[PDB]
């Protein structure tokens, strides 16, 4: 299947890697990325718990909310990391690590 990563709007920052691999983007996760991940997951677990009290399923509701939050937070962190590696988001740390390795 022929592919093309080229975006409509060009990256406004140094392009460290045009099409970074999945594991490379995951390994690029920063402290802020983990903070976003953890915040989304914790809020989602909390909403699951609180909305589960009335039907009596606070634990299962907690697991469901936590799964939704885990998927959403991982997707958000991946979004940010890959955008930094691709030059779409401000990527000072990516460029500093790239110019050295």
């Amino acid at each position: 299947m022929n592919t093309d990563i080229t975006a409509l709007e060009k990256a406004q920052y140094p392009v460290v890697d045009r099409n970074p691999a999945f594991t490379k983007v995951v390994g690029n996760f920063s402290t802020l990325d983990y903070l976003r991940f953890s915040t989304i997951t914790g809020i989602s677990v909390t909403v699951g718990y609180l909305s589960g009290i009335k039907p009596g399923i606070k634990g299962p509701s907690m697991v469901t909310g936590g799964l939704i939050g885990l998927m959403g937070g991982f997707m958000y962190a991946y979004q940010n990391s890959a955008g930094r590696l691709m030059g779409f988001f401000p990527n000072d740390g990516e460029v500093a690590s790239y110019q050295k390795r």
């Binding site: 802020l32 915040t39 718990y49």
Partner: peptide, 29 residues
């Protein structure tokens, strides 16, 4: 002496994690 409801304790941990994480999120952006 001890809070027994485990699911309540995990929910408390999640709420604390969310609060500390939001504070860190502001502090690092």
């Amino acid at each position: 002496k001890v809070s027994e409801d485990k699911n309540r304790n995990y929910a408390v941990v999640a709420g604390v994690v969310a609060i500390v994480g939001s504070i860190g999120w502001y502090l690092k952006a």
